[PDB]
């Protein structure tokens, strides 16, 4: 079978269900990010040659900066940069960790994954997308006031197209979330499907698919971060 | 027929009626007919211009620093310099091509194209 779904380690609290597997995956990604941050702080050396982690972090910051000023300056949105770089590294680590060999057999004839990327769960992508949604909506709010924010978003660039603009205010979150989900969810299916062949034929197609999935995860992380910055700039204007 | 005017910086070279003007602009080979649209283009570094009249042998001219300007009433080729096939000596065209300097090599290549060697 394929058993698409089947969240493991599920539990309940305060009358609400929680998926243990996705929570564990996001915890692993978060602890890896925090470990990298601590490693950077330990080996932070402006005067000396920067460490590899310092090179990585400064590369990410320089990128996200460049796009920011290309769209809007720091002083207008100082806090966007940390948000975007976070989102980026978090999603990238979440997607890349999946490359590790954590696929086994459940004795049922169907493969199982010990570490499933959180983006492959609707909860993670919805959390990220709604967090960004609230963040830049509030950013625009106090950029041009509570009263003016709905007016500007409704009128958009051209007032007489007001209805269409409204749909966009609903589209951006969903489009931000679902795409990411899909981008990762396919992999979860694909690898499972790749388990249909024997090992001596399963090794190759899985190799190719995961090799491409690395680039896919990188591209999706970059796209989500850039679109977050871009929407932040859109909401914070004039 | 269209009025071809091959004109250089130092003087005018040739003028008269023509039925076809083939050349190699930077974008690509272009053939101008009597009612071509107005146009301004830059001839390639080693451009060659072939002019065909009504029943007369084509004039093949090796052009350096060429600019083509076509109008509904006249067509002009403003060249930094330009030499006709008859005056072009094959030995120089062969020997100066593929030289150290790009400009001289292009000029030699244009002369060879005018002769036919390319």
């Amino acid at each position: 079978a394929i058993h698409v779904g089947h969240h493991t380690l599920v539990f309940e609290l305060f009358g609400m269900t929680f998926n243990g597997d996705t929570i564990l995956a996001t915890a692993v990604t978060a602890v890896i990010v925090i470990a990298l941050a601590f490693y950077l702080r330990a080996k932070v050396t402006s005067t000396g040659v920067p460490s590899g982690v310092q090179l990585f972090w400064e590369a990410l910051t320089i990128q996200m900066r460049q796009q920011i000023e290309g769209s809007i300056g720091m002083k207008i949105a100082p806090f966007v940069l940390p948000l975007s770089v976070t989102i980026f590294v978090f999603i990238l680590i979440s997607n890349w960790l999946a490359v590790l060999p954590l696929q086994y057999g459940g004795a049922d004839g169907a493969a199982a994954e010990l570490y499933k990327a959180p983006a492959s769960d609707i909860n993670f992508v919805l959390a990220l997308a709604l967090f960004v949604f609230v963040c830049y909506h509030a950013a625009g709010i106090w950029r041009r006031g509570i009263v003016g924010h709905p007016i500007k978003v409704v009128k958009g660039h051209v007032a007489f197209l007001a209805p269409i603009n409204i749909v966009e205010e609903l589209a951006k979150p969903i489009s931000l979330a679902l795409r990411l989900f899909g981008n990762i969810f396919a992999g979860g299916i694909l690898v499972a499907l790749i388990a249909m062949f024997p090992w001596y034929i399963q090794w190759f197609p899985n190799a190719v698919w995961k090799t491409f999935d690395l680039f896919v995860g990188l591209i999706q992380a970059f796209i989500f971060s850039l679109l977050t910055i871009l929407y932040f700039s859109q909401s914070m204007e004039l | 027929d269209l009025n071809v005017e091959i004109v250089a910086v130092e003087r005018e070279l040739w003028s008269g009626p023509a039925t076809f003007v083939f050349t190699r602009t930077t974008a690509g080979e272009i053939g101008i007919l009597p009612r071509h649209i107005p146009l301004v283009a830059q001839l390639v570094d080693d451009a060659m211009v072939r002019v065909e009249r009504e029943g007369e042998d084509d004039l093949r001219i090796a052009v350096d620093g060429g600019f083509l300007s076509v109008t509904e009433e006249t067509v002009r080729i403003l060249v930094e310099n330009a030499q006709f096939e008859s005056e072009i000596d094959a030995d120089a065209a062969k020997e100066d091509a593929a030289s150290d300097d790009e400009r001289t090599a292009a000029w030699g290549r244009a002369r060879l194209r005018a002769l036919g060697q390319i």
Partner: protein, 85 residues
């Protein structure tokens, strides 16, 4: 002898699938074309980036709206099927 709800459901899912096929095609091609325009504009004028967003965001916007409108009605077809009985 078949459940009327079964036939209605099959029709509703096929209709929603068609709606989303059309919406996906339209959105993908429209966004690709708008992105081609934006990329060409950037290639010609690297500094035009900002001023080119107001056009681009409009186009994508329109395109996206149409697509997402379809999305809504597809849900309407599937989750709350009109005429279901």
């Amino acid at each position: 002898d078949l459940d009327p709800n079964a036939i209605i459901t099959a029709g509703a899912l096929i209709g929603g699938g068609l709606i989303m096929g059309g919406g996906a095609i339209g959105a993908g091609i429209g966004d690709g074309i708008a992105g081609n325009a934006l990329i060409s504009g950037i290639a010609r004028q690297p500094e035009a980036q900002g001023r080119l967003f107001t056009p681009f965001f409009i186009t994508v916007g329109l395109v996206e709206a149409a697509y997402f409108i379809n999305l809504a009605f597809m849900a309407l077809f599937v989750f709350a099927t009109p005429g279901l009985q």
